[PDB]
Amino acid sequence: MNPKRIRALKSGKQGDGPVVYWMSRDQRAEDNWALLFSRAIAKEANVPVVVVFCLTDEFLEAGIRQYEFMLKGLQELEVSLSRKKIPSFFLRGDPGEKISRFVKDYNAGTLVTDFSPLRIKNQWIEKVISGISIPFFEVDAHNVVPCWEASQKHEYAAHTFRPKLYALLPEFLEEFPELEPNSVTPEVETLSDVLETGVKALLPERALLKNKDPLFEPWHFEPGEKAAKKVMESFIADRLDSYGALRNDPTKNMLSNLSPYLHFGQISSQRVVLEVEKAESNPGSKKAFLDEILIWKEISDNFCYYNPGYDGFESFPSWAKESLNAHRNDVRSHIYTLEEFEAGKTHDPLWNASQMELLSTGKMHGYTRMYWAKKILEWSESPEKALEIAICLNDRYELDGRDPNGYAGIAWSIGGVHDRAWGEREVTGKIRYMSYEGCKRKFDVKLYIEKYS
Ligand SMILES: Cc1cc2nc3c(=O)[nH]c(=O)nc-3n(C[C@H](O)[C@H](O)[C@H](O)COP(=O)(O)OP(=O)(O)OC[C@H]3O[C@@H](n4cnc5c(N)ncnc54)[C@H](O)[C@@H]3O)c2cc1C
């Protein structure tokens, strides 16, 4: 129980009632520092712990694919917490109104939540803080090293953040204690109903084909905490060995496929890192994978935490902004609208295949994501319109979207965040370029294009 994982958002008079865990980003019962601290605090106060989750009004800004994945897991989570004698309350509406009202209606003693550097989460904290009188803590249950501990400032490169993070692994990379149940079960609708109503409201905006057939295939990733562990186990046993050599090959499915579970916190990245560390496989593949789930994942939280405008042109490096400004007035070879990007109606069959994989599976291969976002910059009227389009399609169709990794990944592709300058070209300037022929020499593009007609 390292106290550096927890941080106080506001101090107050601790009440004589249950400790409330405002679960948001880490939707799991196991390996959850936020829930573990909540139980520890509730134990010292001789009071039970309770979990509250808010089904917010912004769910209509995504699709059915994300909504069902999240709620199906929450249905499983409600069963796990029950076995621990921990009740779970699911509220519908504004977290500011609902969290504050729950604190007063149930006489909460202390309020706890997990950490997310996203703007929407800060928005909720502001409203909640001004509507409660009890202490309020947040715990980093998503990063191995607490975001505010890994670095005190924005890190402009992976090689400047990698040593800082590895130096702190010996202290923060540790096993998880068991979640002790509640002593006695203490004394707002069912999830099957909130799911049915939500799906009905999302159906008109469901992505379809010409024949009114849904595009999304929901049999690629089963949601839940139990499914995530099976995915983790399969990766270490079968794919981890080849990960280092086939991570950049879209035609081969040699990725961990953990992002949907990591995004919703249905599985702890610290748990994955522990299991990987103790697994014997190709050394370079271990290094490659750990580099992605430790450095690149947690540097994205670092990006969004220390850059209020992480989703804007203002957060780009100075060299990228001055380079992109110098080529604003360059004549673009193609200009596509949002609907044209969305439907995969460009001239580049590789880009359209990447969009089709996004629409059909909700998870685009890591390598094609880079190619996908860079051509949006190349075929847009400006870098600002490119960020807008990339963020829209990413957050709308990726199962792992609306995530710090997404904004940090898009900022890398379009603005060169966490990257260096390259040969100066027109339109894209010094931003790293990825040509069509460059991909042909990297993998069998024809197979990838064929798999997503
Ligand atoms: C334009 C663009 C958009 C992206 N969109 C998202 C997104 O919406 N959500 C998201 O979580 N990630 C995003 N990524 C990062 C990466 O593409 C995906 O995380 C990865 O493809 C997820 O699938 P996986 O778990 O099977 O990959 P794996 O190779 O098995 O890697 C495992 C984990 O390492 C992390 N990781 C891997 N690559 C990156 C990276 N470049 N940056 C940060 N973390 C990484 C992820 O957490 C990932 O789950 C994006 C990257 C780019 C360039």
Explain this structure:
The PDB classes it as flavoprotein. Keywords: redox state, flavoprotein. It forms a monomeric assembly. By secondary structure, the chain is of the alpha/beta class. The chain has 3 domains: 1-141, no CATH class; 142-312, no CATH class; 313-453, no CATH class. Helices cover 49% and strands 7% of the residues. It contains 19 helices and 6 strands. The protein has a 6-stranded mixed sheet. The longest helix has 24 residues, at 283-306. The termini are far apart. Bound molecules: flavin-adenine dinucleotide. Residues 247, 255-259, 262-263, 292-293, 296-297, 300, 366, 369-370, 373, 394, 398, 400-401, 403, 405-406, 409-410, 412-413 line the site of flavin-adenine dinucleotide.
What's the helix and strand layout?
Layout: E1 6-10, E2 19-22, H1 33-44, E3 49-55, H2 64-83, E4 88-92, H3 95-105, E5 110-114, H4 119-129, E6 136-139, H5 147-150, H6 158-172, H7 191-202, H8 225-246, H9 259-263, H10 269-277, H11 283-306, H12 318-326, H13 338-342, H14 349-361, H15 366-378, H16 383-397, H17 404-415, H18 436-440, H19 445-451
Parallel strand pairs: 2-3, 2-5, 3-4, 5-6
Antiparallel strand pairs: 1-6
Bound molecules: flavin-adenine dinucleotide.
PDB class: flavoprotein
Keywords: Oxidoreductase, redox state, photoreduction, flavoprotein
Assembly: monomeric
